[PDB]
Amino acid sequence: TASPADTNVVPAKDAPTTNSPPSTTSPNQAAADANQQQAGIVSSQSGPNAVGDSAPSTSVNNDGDIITRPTSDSIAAVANATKPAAVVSDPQSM
Amino acid sequence: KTVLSRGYIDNAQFNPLALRSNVLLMLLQFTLSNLKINKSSTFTSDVTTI
Amino acid sequence: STMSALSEHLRSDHRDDASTLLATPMINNAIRSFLTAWDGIRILSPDVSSKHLSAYLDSAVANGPELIVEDTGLCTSFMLLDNIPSAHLTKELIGFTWF
Amino acid sequence: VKAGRTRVLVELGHYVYTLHYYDPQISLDEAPILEEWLSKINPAGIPPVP
């Protein structure tokens, strides 16, 4: 009778962007389409509402850039690109 | 090394440029870890000298 | 049906200050049950446990936060310790004597 | 610096420090510890100051 599943419905974790497919071309439109198809709506019934919409995607950075890996790794990548040797061997060292 | 350190920092280094945030989160965890109630226990009567 | 059974029911479900001075994790929800007078049927509150989390689509079943956490030790988080051991000096005095 | 000719002041806002305890009756030169500490500094981070 008093089914909790019908009373305690709340958005799941990572809800706003979970369905976003991994792509770089048009992530927001692609994510929007994925949400629409995931929700069970078919394009033939949504009509004109499906053409211009866009939704948040994981491929888009908070700054508004196309990202292909977690931002920490991007930070790690640039950091690792610059690591001069701590101790070097040269004849004139005192 | 809570944030902005994983991936590039050495196992024995800390990044001075991220110090404030790391300290901030460290204190936050310290704060959260203590969120509990001070229960009352049983008692005994002391008879030892002073 | 029997006075004994009723006595135990009170001795279990309706003693409130009993077993107070100990750590108690079994905090239940607010509502335990309801009784409908017109028919006499009792309704028990559902208990949410993770054997089912079958939310429809991208949703979840909400659960209550773990609020009641209690401690009986010492309210402290800083410790006193000897970083460097002693040199093991002579004691010169042992302890108390009682007769 | 190791010779008595140069004195260095390093500006650190704040830093993580570690320390060692030695025996007063044993002569030693503490240069290797520092040279080790120098050996792990890079533009990304530093080890604790000894």
PDB file of C-alpha atoms in Angstrom:
ATOM      1  CA  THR A   1       0.000   0.000   0.000  1.00  0.00           C
ATOM      2  CA  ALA A   2       2.239   2.792   1.315  1.00  0.00           C
ATOM      3  CA  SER A   3       5.093   2.026  -1.044  1.00  0.00           C
ATOM      4  CA  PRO A   4       8.139   4.161  -0.163  1.00  0.00           C
ATOM      5  CA  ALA A   5       9.340   3.974  -3.763  1.00  0.00           C
ATOM      6  CA  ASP A   6       6.355   6.148  -4.699  1.00  0.00           C
ATOM      7  CA  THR A   7       6.871   8.628  -1.863  1.00  0.00           C
ATOM      8  CA  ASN A   8      10.626   9.144  -1.474  1.00  0.00           C
ATOM      9  CA  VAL A   9      11.410  10.008  -5.094  1.00  0.00           C
ATOM     10  CA  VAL A  10      14.336  12.432  -5.331  1.00  0.00           C
ATOM     11  CA  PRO A  11      16.887  13.211  -8.041  1.00  0.00           C
ATOM     12  CA  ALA A  12      19.676  10.666  -8.196  1.00  0.00           C
ATOM     13  CA  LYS A  13      23.343  11.531  -7.822  1.00  0.00           C
ATOM     14  CA  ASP A  14      24.975  13.106 -10.882  1.00  0.00           C
ATOM     15  CA  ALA A  15      21.470  13.668 -12.246  1.00  0.00           C
ATOM     16  CA  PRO A  16      22.034  16.816 -14.358  1.00  0.00           C
ATOM     17  CA  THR A  17      24.614  15.227 -16.651  1.00  0.00           C
ATOM     18  CA  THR A  18      24.474  11.441 -16.229  1.00  0.00           C
ATOM     19  CA  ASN A  19      23.139  10.604 -19.688  1.00  0.00           C
ATOM     20  CA  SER A  20      25.675  12.691 -21.601  1.00  0.00           C
ATOM     21  CA  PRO A  21      27.433  10.572 -24.239  1.00  0.00           C
ATOM     22  CA  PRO A  22      31.207  10.916 -24.589  1.00  0.00           C
ATOM     23  CA  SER A  23      31.787  13.195 -27.572  1.00  0.00           C
ATOM     24  CA  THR A  24      33.460  16.435 -28.574  1.00  0.00           C
ATOM     25  CA  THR A  25      31.339  17.617 -31.504  1.00  0.00           C
ATOM     26  CA  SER A  26      28.196  19.119 -29.939  1.00  0.00           C
ATOM     27  CA  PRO A  27      28.109  17.784 -26.386  1.00  0.00           C
ATOM     28  CA  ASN A  28      25.206  19.900 -25.173  1.00  0.00           C
ATOM     29  CA  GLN A  29      22.870  19.001 -28.029  1.00  0.00           C
ATOM     30  CA  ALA A  30      23.921  15.362 -27.832  1.00  0.00           C
ATOM     31  CA  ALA A  31      23.314  15.294 -24.089  1.00  0.00           C
ATOM     32  CA  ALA A  32      19.917  16.913 -24.589  1.00  0.00           C
ATOM     33  CA  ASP A  33      18.957  14.279 -27.144  1.00  0.00           C
ATOM     34  CA  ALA A  34      20.135  11.496 -24.837  1.00  0.00           C
ATOM     35  CA  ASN A  35      17.958  12.830 -22.023  1.00  0.00           C
ATOM     36  CA  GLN A  36      14.973  13.027 -24.356  1.00  0.00           C
ATOM     37  CA  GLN A  37      15.458   9.493 -25.645  1.00  0.00           C
ATOM     38  CA  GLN A  38      16.225   8.196 -22.156  1.00  0.00           C
ATOM     39  CA  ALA A  39      12.979   9.637 -20.802  1.00  0.00           C
ATOM     40  CA  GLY A  40      11.017   7.482 -23.255  1.00  0.00           C
ATOM     41  CA  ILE A  41       9.885  10.379 -25.443  1.00  0.00           C
ATOM     42  CA  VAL A  42      10.149   9.728 -29.176  1.00  0.00           C
ATOM     43  CA  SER A  43      11.047  12.528 -31.573  1.00  0.00           C
ATOM     44  CA  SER A  44       7.927  11.972 -33.679  1.00  0.00           C
ATOM     45  CA  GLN A  45       5.827  12.971 -30.656  1.00  0.00           C
ATOM     46  CA  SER A  46       7.951  15.833 -29.305  1.00  0.00           C
ATOM     47  CA  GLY A  47       7.799  17.600 -32.666  1.00  0.00           C
ATOM     48  CA  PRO A  48       9.496  20.990 -32.934  1.00  0.00           C
ATOM     49  CA  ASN A  49      10.515  20.943 -29.263  1.00  0.00           C
ATOM     50  CA  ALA A  50      13.498  18.692 -30.014  1.00  0.00           C
ATOM     51  CA  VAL A  51      15.457  20.867 -32.433  1.00  0.00           C
ATOM     52  CA  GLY A  52      17.054  23.713 -30.490  1.00  0.00           C
ATOM     53  CA  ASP A  53      17.371  22.401 -26.956  1.00  0.00           C
ATOM     54  CA  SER A  54      20.661  21.707 -25.194  1.00  0.00           C
ATOM     55  CA  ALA A  55      21.632  20.194 -21.852  1.00  0.00           C
ATOM     56  CA  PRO A  56      24.739  20.093 -19.647  1.00  0.00           C
ATOM     57  CA  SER A  57      27.345  17.463 -20.451  1.00  0.00           C
ATOM     58  CA  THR A  58      30.438  16.035 -18.807  1.00  0.00           C
ATOM     59  CA  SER A  59      32.514  16.805 -21.898  1.00  0.00           C
ATOM     60  CA  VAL A  60      32.082  20.528 -21.155  1.00  0.00           C
ATOM     61  CA  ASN A  61      34.316  22.203 -18.594  1.00  0.00           C
ATOM     62  CA  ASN A  62      32.951  24.564 -15.967  1.00  0.00           C
ATOM     63  CA  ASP A  63      34.944  27.288 -17.707  1.00  0.00           C
ATOM     64  CA  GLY A  64      33.133  26.380 -20.920  1.00  0.00           C
ATOM     65  CA  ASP A  65      35.706  24.267 -22.741  1.00  0.00           C
ATOM     66  CA  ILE A  66      35.682  20.873 -24.431  1.00  0.00           C
ATOM     67  CA  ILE A  67      37.426  18.443 -22.086  1.00  0.00           C
ATOM     68  CA  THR A  68      38.368  14.828 -22.721  1.00  0.00           C
ATOM     69  CA  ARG A  69      39.678  13.880 -19.263  1.00  0.00           C
ATOM     70  CA  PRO A  70      39.066  14.969 -15.661  1.00  0.00           C
ATOM     71  CA  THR A  71      40.368  18.465 -15.058  1.00  0.00           C
ATOM     72  CA  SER A  72      42.793  17.321 -12.360  1.00  0.00           C
ATOM     73  CA  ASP A  73      44.604  15.233 -14.962  1.00  0.00           C
ATOM     74  CA  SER A  74      44.853  18.289 -17.198  1.00  0.00           C
ATOM     75  CA  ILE A  75      46.451  20.102 -14.270  1.00  0.00           C
ATOM     76  CA  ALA A  76      48.689  17.092 -13.710  1.00  0.00           C
ATOM     77  CA  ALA A  77      49.656  16.975 -17.382  1.00  0.00           C
ATOM     78  CA  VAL A  78      50.876  20.566 -17.526  1.00  0.00           C
ATOM     79  CA  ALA A  79      52.634  20.191 -14.179  1.00  0.00           C
ATOM     80  CA  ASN A  80      54.516  17.095 -15.308  1.00  0.00           C
ATOM     81  CA  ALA A  81      55.621  18.845 -18.502  1.00  0.00           C
ATOM     82  CA  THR A  82      57.931  21.086 -16.430  1.00  0.00           C
ATOM     83  CA  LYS A  83      60.145  19.284 -13.908  1.00  0.00           C
ATOM     84  CA  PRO A  84      63.803  20.306 -14.106  1.00  0.00           C
ATOM     85  CA  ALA A  85      66.292  17.876 -12.631  1.00  0.00           C
ATOM     86  CA  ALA A  86      66.939  18.615  -8.972  1.00  0.00           C
ATOM     87  CA  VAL A  87      70.585  17.490  -8.899  1.00  0.00           C
ATOM     88  CA  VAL A  88      72.707  17.806 -12.023  1.00  0.00           C
ATOM     89  CA  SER A  89      76.281  16.705 -12.693  1.00  0.00           C
ATOM     90  CA  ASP A  90      78.667  19.332 -14.022  1.00  0.00           C
ATOM     91  CA  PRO A  91      82.454  19.451 -13.640  1.00  0.00           C
ATOM     92  CA  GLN A  92      82.509  22.924 -12.071  1.00  0.00           C
ATOM     93  CA  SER A  93      80.538  22.513  -8.865  1.00  0.00           C
ATOM     94  CA  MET A  94      82.817  23.326  -5.872  1.00  0.00           C
TER      95      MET A  94
ATOM     96  CA  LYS B   1      47.115  16.545  -0.575  1.00  0.00           C
ATOM     97  CA  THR B   2      43.325  16.609  -0.398  1.00  0.00           C
ATOM     98  CA  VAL B   3      42.798  18.616  -3.596  1.00  0.00           C
ATOM     99  CA  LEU B   4      44.741  19.966  -6.562  1.00  0.00           C
ATOM    100  CA  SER B   5      47.637  17.634  -5.783  1.00  0.00           C
ATOM    101  CA  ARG B   6      46.761  14.158  -7.021  1.00  0.00           C
ATOM    102  CA  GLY B   7      48.660  13.145 -10.131  1.00  0.00           C
ATOM    103  CA  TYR B   8      51.755  15.331 -10.134  1.00  0.00           C
ATOM    104  CA  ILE B   9      52.874  15.951  -6.555  1.00  0.00           C
ATOM    105  CA  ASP B  10      55.611  13.740  -5.200  1.00  0.00           C
ATOM    106  CA  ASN B  11      54.813  11.306  -2.413  1.00  0.00           C
ATOM    107  CA  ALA B  12      56.943  13.463  -0.084  1.00  0.00           C
ATOM    108  CA  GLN B  13      56.112  16.989  -1.302  1.00  0.00           C
ATOM    109  CA  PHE B  14      53.355  19.506  -0.736  1.00  0.00           C
ATOM    110  CA  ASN B  15      52.429  22.351  -3.060  1.00  0.00           C
ATOM    111  CA  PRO B  16      52.737  25.687  -1.226  1.00  0.00           C
ATOM    112  CA  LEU B  17      50.462  27.383  -3.755  1.00  0.00           C
ATOM    113  CA  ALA B  18      47.495  25.218  -2.708  1.00  0.00           C
ATOM    114  CA  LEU B  19      48.167  25.462   1.020  1.00  0.00           C
ATOM    115  CA  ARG B  20      45.129  27.470   2.097  1.00  0.00           C
ATOM    116  CA  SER B  21      42.585  25.229   0.400  1.00  0.00           C
ATOM    117  CA  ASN B  22      44.275  22.064   1.653  1.00  0.00           C
ATOM    118  CA  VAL B  23      44.377  23.416   5.200  1.00  0.00           C
ATOM    119  CA  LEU B  24      40.779  24.553   4.848  1.00  0.00           C
ATOM    120  CA  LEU B  25      39.560  21.104   3.844  1.00  0.00           C
ATOM    121  CA  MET B  26      41.704  19.463   6.513  1.00  0.00           C
ATOM    122  CA  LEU B  27      40.019  21.557   9.188  1.00  0.00           C
ATOM    123  CA  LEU B  28      36.621  20.789   7.676  1.00  0.00           C
ATOM    124  CA  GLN B  29      37.243  17.061   8.004  1.00  0.00           C
ATOM    125  CA  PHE B  30      38.483  17.678  11.531  1.00  0.00           C
ATOM    126  CA  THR B  31      35.233  19.502  12.252  1.00  0.00           C
ATOM    127  CA  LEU B  32      32.968  16.869  10.723  1.00  0.00           C
ATOM    128  CA  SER B  33      34.766  14.048  12.515  1.00  0.00           C
ATOM    129  CA  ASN B  34      33.713  15.387  15.924  1.00  0.00           C
ATOM    130  CA  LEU B  35      29.988  15.907  15.261  1.00  0.00           C
ATOM    131  CA  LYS B  36      28.639  13.610  17.957  1.00  0.00           C
ATOM    132  CA  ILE B  37      26.755  13.765  21.237  1.00  0.00           C
ATOM    133  CA  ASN B  38      28.402  13.693  24.668  1.00  0.00           C
ATOM    134  CA  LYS B  39      26.617  10.787  26.321  1.00  0.00           C
ATOM    135  CA  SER B  40      26.529  10.375  30.098  1.00  0.00           C
ATOM    136  CA  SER B  41      28.058   7.278  31.682  1.00  0.00           C
ATOM    137  CA  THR B  42      27.764   5.609  35.078  1.00  0.00           C
ATOM    138  CA  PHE B  43      29.491   6.991  38.164  1.00  0.00           C
ATOM    139  CA  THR B  44      31.313   5.837  41.273  1.00  0.00           C
ATOM    140  CA  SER B  45      32.125   7.556  44.550  1.00  0.00           C
ATOM    141  CA  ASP B  46      35.786   8.238  45.258  1.00  0.00           C
ATOM    142  CA  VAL B  47      37.301   7.546  48.668  1.00  0.00           C
ATOM    143  CA  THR B  48      40.965   8.020  47.726  1.00  0.00           C
ATOM    144  CA  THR B  49      42.575  10.604  50.019  1.00  0.00           C
ATOM    145  CA  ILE B  50      42.128  14.241  49.042  1.00  0.00           C
TER     146      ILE B  50
ATOM    147  CA  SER C   1      -6.026 -13.162  25.117  1.00  0.00           C
ATOM    148  CA  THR C   2      -4.048 -13.599  28.353  1.00  0.00           C
ATOM    149  CA  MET C   3      -2.956 -11.120  30.993  1.00  0.00           C
ATOM    150  CA  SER C   4       0.586 -12.450  30.652  1.00  0.00           C
ATOM    151  CA  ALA C   5       0.763 -11.572  26.958  1.00  0.00           C
ATOM    152  CA  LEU C   6      -0.512  -8.053  27.572  1.00  0.00           C
ATOM    153  CA  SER C   7       1.984  -7.605  30.400  1.00  0.00           C
ATOM    154  CA  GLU C   8       4.888  -8.478  28.118  1.00  0.00           C
ATOM    155  CA  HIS C   9       3.585  -6.137  25.424  1.00  0.00           C
ATOM    156  CA  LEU C  10       3.760  -3.269  27.909  1.00  0.00           C
ATOM    157  CA  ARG C  11       7.081  -4.588  29.206  1.00  0.00           C
ATOM    158  CA  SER C  12       8.508  -4.334  25.675  1.00  0.00           C
ATOM    159  CA  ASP C  13       6.702  -1.679  23.638  1.00  0.00           C
ATOM    160  CA  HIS C  14       5.637   0.764  26.345  1.00  0.00           C
ATOM    161  CA  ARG C  15       8.542   1.138  28.768  1.00  0.00           C
ATOM    162  CA  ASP C  16      10.355   4.346  27.891  1.00  0.00           C
ATOM    163  CA  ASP C  17      12.928   5.312  30.524  1.00  0.00           C
ATOM    164  CA  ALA C  18      14.177   1.712  30.686  1.00  0.00           C
ATOM    165  CA  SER C  19      17.709   0.839  29.548  1.00  0.00           C
ATOM    166  CA  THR C  20      18.705   4.497  29.391  1.00  0.00           C
ATOM    167  CA  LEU C  21      22.300   4.570  30.643  1.00  0.00           C
ATOM    168  CA  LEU C  22      23.952   2.871  27.664  1.00  0.00           C
ATOM    169  CA  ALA C  23      24.855   3.540  24.050  1.00  0.00           C
ATOM    170  CA  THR C  24      21.725   3.076  21.942  1.00  0.00           C
ATOM    171  CA  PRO C  25      22.010   2.945  18.131  1.00  0.00           C
ATOM    172  CA  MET C  26      18.580   1.442  17.416  1.00  0.00           C
ATOM    173  CA  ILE C  27      16.842   4.767  16.788  1.00  0.00           C
ATOM    174  CA  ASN C  28      13.706   4.112  14.750  1.00  0.00           C
ATOM    175  CA  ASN C  29      11.516   6.489  12.767  1.00  0.00           C
ATOM    176  CA  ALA C  30       8.920   8.797  14.290  1.00  0.00           C
ATOM    177  CA  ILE C  31       5.844   6.710  13.480  1.00  0.00           C
ATOM    178  CA  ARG C  32       5.870   3.091  14.550  1.00  0.00           C
ATOM    179  CA  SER C  33       2.282   2.116  13.755  1.00  0.00           C
ATOM    180  CA  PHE C  34      -1.310   3.265  13.442  1.00  0.00           C
ATOM    181  CA  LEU C  35      -4.563   1.553  14.365  1.00  0.00           C
ATOM    182  CA  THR C  36      -7.771   2.182  12.455  1.00  0.00           C
ATOM    183  CA  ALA C  37     -10.675   2.235  14.892  1.00  0.00           C
ATOM    184  CA  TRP C  38     -13.484   1.508  12.444  1.00  0.00           C
ATOM    185  CA  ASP C  39     -12.025  -1.876  11.487  1.00  0.00           C
ATOM    186  CA  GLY C  40      -9.358  -2.612  14.092  1.00  0.00           C
ATOM    187  CA  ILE C  41      -6.576  -3.235  11.573  1.00  0.00           C
ATOM    188  CA  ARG C  42      -3.099  -2.055  12.536  1.00  0.00           C
ATOM    189  CA  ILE C  43      -0.767  -0.489   9.974  1.00  0.00           C
ATOM    190  CA  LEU C  44       2.986  -0.709  10.473  1.00  0.00           C
ATOM    191  CA  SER C  45       5.263   1.991   9.136  1.00  0.00           C
ATOM    192  CA  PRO C  46       7.366   0.738   6.208  1.00  0.00           C
ATOM    193  CA  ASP C  47      11.076   0.344   6.886  1.00  0.00           C
ATOM    194  CA  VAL C  48      13.391   1.553   4.128  1.00  0.00           C
ATOM    195  CA  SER C  49      16.366  -0.760   3.656  1.00  0.00           C
ATOM    196  CA  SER C  50      18.602  -1.202   0.645  1.00  0.00           C
ATOM    197  CA  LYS C  51      17.247  -4.602  -0.414  1.00  0.00           C
ATOM    198  CA  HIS C  52      15.232  -2.382  -2.764  1.00  0.00           C
ATOM    199  CA  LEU C  53      16.299   0.967  -4.207  1.00  0.00           C
ATOM    200  CA  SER C  54      14.201   0.599  -7.345  1.00  0.00           C
ATOM    201  CA  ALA C  55      13.614   4.225  -8.233  1.00  0.00           C
ATOM    202  CA  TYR C  56      12.097   4.832 -11.652  1.00  0.00           C
ATOM    203  CA  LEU C  57      14.533   6.307 -14.199  1.00  0.00           C
ATOM    204  CA  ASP C  58      17.251   8.709 -12.990  1.00  0.00           C
ATOM    205  CA  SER C  59      16.020   9.062  -9.431  1.00  0.00           C
ATOM    206  CA  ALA C  60      16.681   7.648  -5.983  1.00  0.00           C
ATOM    207  CA  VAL C  61      14.798   6.798  -2.808  1.00  0.00           C
ATOM    208  CA  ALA C  62      15.570   9.357  -0.125  1.00  0.00           C
ATOM    209  CA  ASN C  63      16.869   8.184   3.246  1.00  0.00           C
ATOM    210  CA  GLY C  64      17.223   9.941   6.567  1.00  0.00           C
ATOM    211  CA  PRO C  65      20.603  11.338   7.564  1.00  0.00           C
ATOM    212  CA  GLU C  66      22.468   9.655  10.396  1.00  0.00           C
ATOM    213  CA  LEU C  67      21.882  12.204  13.146  1.00  0.00           C
ATOM    214  CA  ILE C  68      22.028  10.373  16.482  1.00  0.00           C
ATOM    215  CA  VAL C  69      25.700   9.593  17.137  1.00  0.00           C
ATOM    216  CA  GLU C  70      26.923   9.519  20.725  1.00  0.00           C
ATOM    217  CA  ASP C  71      30.220   9.104  22.552  1.00  0.00           C
ATOM    218  CA  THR C  72      31.040   7.999  26.082  1.00  0.00           C
ATOM    219  CA  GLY C  73      34.819   8.402  26.039  1.00  0.00           C
ATOM    220  CA  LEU C  74      36.674  11.678  26.546  1.00  0.00           C
ATOM    221  CA  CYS C  75      35.636  14.755  24.569  1.00  0.00           C
ATOM    222  CA  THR C  76      39.048  15.463  23.113  1.00  0.00           C
ATOM    223  CA  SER C  77      41.000  15.164  19.892  1.00  0.00           C
ATOM    224  CA  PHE C  78      44.491  16.236  20.999  1.00  0.00           C
ATOM    225  CA  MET C  79      46.809  13.704  22.597  1.00  0.00           C
ATOM    226  CA  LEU C  80      49.775  13.989  24.936  1.00  0.00           C
ATOM    227  CA  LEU C  81      52.691  11.713  24.140  1.00  0.00           C
ATOM    228  CA  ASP C  82      56.413  11.324  24.704  1.00  0.00           C
ATOM    229  CA  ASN C  83      58.105  11.899  21.367  1.00  0.00           C
ATOM    230  CA  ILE C  84      61.484  10.780  22.738  1.00  0.00           C
ATOM    231  CA  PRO C  85      61.708   7.984  25.337  1.00  0.00           C
ATOM    232  CA  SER C  86      63.187   8.595  28.760  1.00  0.00           C
ATOM    233  CA  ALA C  87      66.648   7.516  29.902  1.00  0.00           C
ATOM    234  CA  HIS C  88      65.245   4.998  32.428  1.00  0.00           C
ATOM    235  CA  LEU C  89      66.345   6.651  35.641  1.00  0.00           C
ATOM    236  CA  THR C  90      66.153   5.125  39.097  1.00  0.00           C
ATOM    237  CA  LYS C  91      62.740   5.496  40.689  1.00  0.00           C
ATOM    238  CA  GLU C  92      63.667   6.449  44.300  1.00  0.00           C
ATOM    239  CA  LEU C  93      59.988   6.075  45.329  1.00  0.00           C
ATOM    240  CA  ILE C  94      57.602   3.227  44.577  1.00  0.00           C
ATOM    241  CA  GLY C  95      54.020   3.881  45.598  1.00  0.00           C
ATOM    242  CA  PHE C  96      51.377   4.018  48.281  1.00  0.00           C
ATOM    243  CA  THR C  97      51.123   1.511  51.110  1.00  0.00           C
ATOM    244  CA  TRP C  98      47.908   0.406  52.821  1.00  0.00           C
ATOM    245  CA  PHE C  99      48.656  -1.622  55.934  1.00  0.00           C
TER     246      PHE C  99
ATOM    247  CA  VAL D   1      76.929  28.650   2.372  1.00  0.00           C
ATOM    248  CA  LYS D   2      78.662  25.586   3.790  1.00  0.00           C
ATOM    249  CA  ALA D   3      81.826  27.632   3.993  1.00  0.00           C
ATOM    250  CA  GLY D   4      81.582  30.625   6.278  1.00  0.00           C
ATOM    251  CA  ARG D   5      81.097  33.084   3.423  1.00  0.00           C
ATOM    252  CA  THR D   6      77.400  33.291   2.503  1.00  0.00           C
ATOM    253  CA  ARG D   7      74.187  33.649   4.499  1.00  0.00           C
ATOM    254  CA  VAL D   8      70.794  32.901   2.968  1.00  0.00           C
ATOM    255  CA  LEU D   9      67.304  33.997   3.993  1.00  0.00           C
ATOM    256  CA  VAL D  10      64.501  32.055   2.308  1.00  0.00           C
ATOM    257  CA  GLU D  11      61.067  33.680   2.338  1.00  0.00           C
ATOM    258  CA  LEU D  12      58.361  31.140   3.145  1.00  0.00           C
ATOM    259  CA  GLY D  13      54.931  32.318   4.173  1.00  0.00           C
ATOM    260  CA  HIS D  14      54.119  29.084   5.960  1.00  0.00           C
ATOM    261  CA  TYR D  15      55.386  25.550   5.599  1.00  0.00           C
ATOM    262  CA  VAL D  16      55.251  22.021   6.946  1.00  0.00           C
ATOM    263  CA  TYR D  17      58.222  21.277   9.181  1.00  0.00           C
ATOM    264  CA  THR D  18      59.812  18.116  10.510  1.00  0.00           C
ATOM    265  CA  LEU D  19      62.632  17.732  12.992  1.00  0.00           C
ATOM    266  CA  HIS D  20      65.255  15.269  14.180  1.00  0.00           C
ATOM    267  CA  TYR D  21      66.665  14.702  17.648  1.00  0.00           C
ATOM    268  CA  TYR D  22      70.365  13.983  18.033  1.00  0.00           C
ATOM    269  CA  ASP D  23      72.720  13.086  20.854  1.00  0.00           C
ATOM    270  CA  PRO D  24      74.654  16.007  22.385  1.00  0.00           C
ATOM    271  CA  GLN D  25      77.730  13.816  22.903  1.00  0.00           C
ATOM    272  CA  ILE D  26      78.169  12.921  19.216  1.00  0.00           C
ATOM    273  CA  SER D  27      79.914  15.246  16.798  1.00  0.00           C
ATOM    274  CA  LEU D  28      78.331  15.507  13.368  1.00  0.00           C
ATOM    275  CA  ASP D  29      77.804  17.716  10.339  1.00  0.00           C
ATOM    276  CA  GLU D  30      74.159  18.247   9.419  1.00  0.00           C
ATOM    277  CA  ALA D  31      74.892  19.189   5.804  1.00  0.00           C
ATOM    278  CA  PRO D  32      73.692  15.856   4.305  1.00  0.00           C
ATOM    279  CA  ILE D  33      70.199  16.326   5.730  1.00  0.00           C
ATOM    280  CA  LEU D  34      69.844  19.698   4.029  1.00  0.00           C
ATOM    281  CA  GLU D  35      71.399  18.475   0.792  1.00  0.00           C
ATOM    282  CA  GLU D  36      68.830  15.699   0.862  1.00  0.00           C
ATOM    283  CA  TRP D  37      66.121  18.293   1.464  1.00  0.00           C
ATOM    284  CA  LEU D  38      67.396  20.342  -1.463  1.00  0.00           C
ATOM    285  CA  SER D  39      67.348  17.243  -3.652  1.00  0.00           C
ATOM    286  CA  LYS D  40      63.537  17.010  -3.631  1.00  0.00           C
ATOM    287  CA  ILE D  41      62.545  20.596  -4.407  1.00  0.00           C
ATOM    288  CA  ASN D  42      60.955  21.329  -7.771  1.00  0.00           C
ATOM    289  CA  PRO D  43      58.628  23.970  -9.254  1.00  0.00           C
ATOM    290  CA  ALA D  44      55.663  21.817  -8.213  1.00  0.00           C
ATOM    291  CA  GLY D  45      56.270  21.324  -4.494  1.00  0.00           C
ATOM    292  CA  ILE D  46      58.733  20.954  -1.653  1.00  0.00           C
ATOM    293  CA  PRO D  47      59.305  18.403   1.114  1.00  0.00           C
ATOM    294  CA  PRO D  48      58.925  19.375   4.779  1.00  0.00           C
ATOM    295  CA  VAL D  49      61.675  21.564   6.181  1.00  0.00           C
ATOM    296  CA  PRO D  50      64.046  19.570   8.425  1.00  0.00           C
TER     297      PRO D  50
END
